[PDB]
Design an enzyme around this catalytic site. Sequence first.
Site, PDB file in Angstrom:
ATOM      1  N   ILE A 154       0.852  -1.198   0.000  1.00  0.00           N
ATOM      2  CA  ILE A 154       0.000   0.000   0.000  1.00  0.00           C
ATOM      3  C   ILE A 154       0.896   1.261   0.000  1.00  0.00           C
ATOM      4  O   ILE A 154       0.706   2.145  -0.836  1.00  0.00           O
ATOM      5  CB  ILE A 154      -1.050   0.016   1.156  1.00  0.00           C
ATOM      6  CG1 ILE A 154      -2.086  -1.129   0.988  1.00  0.00           C
ATOM      7  CG2 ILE A 154      -1.757   1.392   1.247  1.00  0.00           C
ATOM      8  CD1 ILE A 154      -3.055  -1.354   2.209  1.00  0.00           C
ATOM      9  N   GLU A 205       4.565   3.369   2.409  1.00  0.00           N
ATOM     10  CA  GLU A 205       5.491   3.357   3.541  1.00  0.00           C
ATOM     11  C   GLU A 205       5.910   4.755   4.022  1.00  0.00           C
ATOM     12  O   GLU A 205       5.939   5.715   3.254  1.00  0.00           O
ATOM     13  CB  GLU A 205       6.744   2.502   3.238  1.00  0.00           C
ATOM     14  CG  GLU A 205       7.646   3.004   2.121  1.00  0.00           C
ATOM     15  CD  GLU A 205       8.717   2.007   1.732  1.00  0.00           C
ATOM     16  OE1 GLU A 205       9.874   2.170   2.183  1.00  0.00           O
ATOM     17  OE2 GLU A 205       8.391   1.044   1.001  1.00  0.00           O
ATOM     18  N   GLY A 248       8.027   2.620   8.969  1.00  0.00           N
ATOM     19  CA  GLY A 248       6.940   1.669   8.776  1.00  0.00           C
ATOM     20  C   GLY A 248       6.523   1.436   7.338  1.00  0.00           C
ATOM     21  O   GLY A 248       6.746   2.293   6.480  1.00  0.00           O
ATOM     22  N   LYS A 284       0.285  -2.877   9.258  1.00  0.00           N
ATOM     23  CA  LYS A 284       1.326  -1.861   9.354  1.00  0.00           C
ATOM     24  C   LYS A 284       2.545  -2.450  10.077  1.00  0.00           C
ATOM     25  O   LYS A 284       2.454  -2.824  11.255  1.00  0.00           O
ATOM     26  CB  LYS A 284       0.793  -0.595  10.066  1.00  0.00           C
ATOM     27  CG  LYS A 284       1.779   0.577  10.122  1.00  0.00           C
ATOM     28  CD  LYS A 284       1.107   1.890  10.537  1.00  0.00           C
ATOM     29  CE  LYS A 284       1.205   2.164  12.021  1.00  0.00           C
ATOM     30  NZ  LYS A 284       0.421   3.356  12.437  1.00  0.00           N
ATOM     31  N   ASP A 328      -2.401  15.082  14.448  1.00  0.00           N
ATOM     32  CA  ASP A 328      -1.972  14.855  13.062  1.00  0.00           C
ATOM     33  C   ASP A 328      -3.162  14.563  12.123  1.00  0.00           C
ATOM     34  O   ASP A 328      -3.096  13.675  11.263  1.00  0.00           O
ATOM     35  CB  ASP A 328      -0.921  13.721  12.995  1.00  0.00           C
ATOM     36  CG  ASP A 328      -0.084  13.712  11.719  1.00  0.00           C
ATOM     37  OD1 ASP A 328       0.370  12.614  11.314  1.00  0.00           O
ATOM     38  OD2 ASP A 328       0.089  14.796  11.109  1.00  0.00           O
TER      39      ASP A 328
END
Length: 334
Positions: A24, A26, A30, A47, A142
């Site tokens: 998906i 990065e 991670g 994740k 965030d």
Amino acid sequence: GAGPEMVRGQVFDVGPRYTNLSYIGEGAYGMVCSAYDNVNKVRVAIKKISPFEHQTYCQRTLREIKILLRFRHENIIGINDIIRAPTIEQMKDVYIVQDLMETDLYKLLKTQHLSNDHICYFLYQILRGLKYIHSANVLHRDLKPSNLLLNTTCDLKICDFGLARVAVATRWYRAPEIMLNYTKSIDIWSVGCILAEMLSNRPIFPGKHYLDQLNHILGILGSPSQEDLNCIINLKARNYLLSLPHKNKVPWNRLFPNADSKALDLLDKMLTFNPHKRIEVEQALAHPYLEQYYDPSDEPIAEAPFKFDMELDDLPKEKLKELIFEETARFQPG
Ligand SMILES: O=c1[nH][nH]c2cc(Nc3ncc(Nc4ccccc4)c(Nc4cc(C5CC5)n[nH]4)n3)ccc12
């Protein structure tokens, strides 16, 4: 045995339960993939987190795990499973397994135009989830389109609680007081930036750096008042803002000519420079723009404020590794 699973030359040791991996994206420490769960017979999101080189990454990993395991809400991503090594000596990565959503709001706004009813519904769900986070006396810190997940039916979930704290981020969605001097009001600023972005498919304040950000904000709000700057703010920022010539206020209906009048009224209350005068989550939810969705009888709040039993900022990374090892133990067979 097939041996450990791999994604783009990196180990992604989630088998035998999780297979058929698909990349998906990065971040700095991670990697996220989709996978097939042979138990629940559905695709999930996984994740991979490698935080053990740094104390701050260790703190972030423990905070998110503790917060998301405690939190229970339709508009907040959960943690279904956690994979890590059988011993602390072998644990170099932590894999968090979560529900797979079709897309994030960043990717949707890059390819699709939203009608006013979809903007209203997405905004409602963001603030519904935020009402729960804030009722637990937690700040997300965030909030941005890439941290808002969407499914086929338009259901929204807030993700990525690594920077979350009890009561730094992507600069375009940062409250001016974070740059100047934080509080629950910084999340309302971010939601304001997201609403503006949903109306025009473009970020409202796309600064290249910290000074360009402040210039972009002033470019629309106009020069701040004496009261707007009368706070515990850094001298560099204050002197820089006082050195600037006058900037006129740009009316919201001039920036978004065909946007719903009620949506611009709420946008104005969220994108207020002074955080003390900024609308709070409950008042935002009760605003006339969100009238067709506001349902106080179906907007749950946390039973108690969330709190960390330990002083996570003060703990060495070796101590945080032990706490992460123990926190993830309940997902191990036994
Ligand atoms: O941890 C994250 N913080 N912000 C993030 C944005 C992402 N973006 C994302 N884009 C698309 C999908 N869906 C997808 C489905 C099929 C094929 C390709 C992609 C997606 N899904 C997703 C992520 C999560 C959990 C956050 C990891 N659940 N579902 N995430 C993925 C992960 C994160």
